[PDB]
Symmetry: D2
Subunit: 127 residues, 4 copies
């Protein structure tokens, strides 16, 4: 499996599932951005989901400081490849990372052509 | 104001949506059961969703006494008629109704071939 | 039949539900943007959900031309007012509208503190 | 972590998530049934979700033959423990296992007090 700008202890993991085929959503492009000082989105990390529909190694604990992050999932390209016309241009998830709460962030997203559900699982101690 | 096997203030409404087509789920069979004194499921009401994906008139305030109800949605027939072999046999929703007085219940379900989401909206009579 | 910054045949409706309370999400701020010629997001319409968790009258058929729209839902304010610190900053829905003629769009979103599901219902004008 | 009536190659895995707390749903009771010849549900396996919100070792490949299965999740007890009043009595998932399709079944369910989403991921070659 590929990675990102941080194959180490994994503070941020992305998982994408397909609700039409009941499978991992493979080779979906994912871009991560950090909100900058000027209220702009700064490229942060990116990759393509693996065979298991996951993306790890996006970052390291050292680099993943408190701030606002955006995860963008290119859902439109995914459906087009399957020959299904989708509604959304992409799926976006925007959240604050706080040092206070748990330390590992899993963003899981379930895709259908006209709908998506996204959830966050935030946990401590490795897993 | 009650009636008795029709539709009061419309105490029980079912709404079904299709996440693949981005439309109401039309002509979906719905069966409702009530838990009997003997712990068995007794037939309570049935119908099919309309062109708007809604099912009203299942019951009346008078007939819809306190109890445990099961709303069964025939999702399998729905997908097969579209040419898709789905994962689930049906979607079932089981809940206690009216145990603190009469309420109006909306059961909304979003359908995908390998996934479904169901939510309830409960309100306190009067308009 | 069109108008121009009001509500046609009601081409754009937003509905927000609360999965924690089993009720409409009331007084939720919604902002809509349209992608400008210069690739920037231009303010298009705004409002707050009603007691039924709906927002109508954002636009008219005449004003709602072909384009890429972004519906931003202020979920964070909603949860904080309930005493809950949620995960997301907001929920955003991005879609191309009317690129094959005028359509009516319903954007329905179900909210949980760490999760949300969004679906679109698209219909072909006339009643 | 506990198991069931089959800690071996894992043909059926259950995962439960909490949408209010953004965590694994721990110590949730799960009962699995197989539809018998008389149209009755036969106890098949059971357990409690682990710290990661998962249940493995429910069965073995030898025992998991084609047929209709029901997974019942005691969601009501889970919310009561948290001091939250829930809508549903439990969450039920009913599906056919077919030797034809993929061989590993993951049933993932996301819980809120008034809503749940369930999806199936069906895959081949181990993971």
């Amino acid at each position: 499996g590929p990675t990102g700008t941080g194959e180490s202890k994994c503070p941020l993991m992305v998982k994408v599932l397909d609700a039409v085929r009941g499978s991992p959503a493979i080779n979906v492009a994912v871009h991560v951005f950090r909100k900058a000082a000027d209220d702009t989105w700064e490229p942060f990390a990116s990759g393509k989901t693996s065979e298991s529909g996951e993306l790890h190694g996006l970052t390291t604990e050292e680099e993943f400081v408190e701030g606002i992050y955006k995860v963008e999932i290119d859902t439109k390209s995914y459906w087009k490849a399957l020959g299904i016309s989708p509604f959304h241009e992409h799926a976006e998830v925007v959240f604050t990372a706080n040092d206070s709460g748990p330390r590992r962030y899993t963003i899981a997203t379930l895709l259908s052509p006209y709908s998506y559900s996204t959830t966050a699982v935030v946990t401590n101690p490795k897993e």
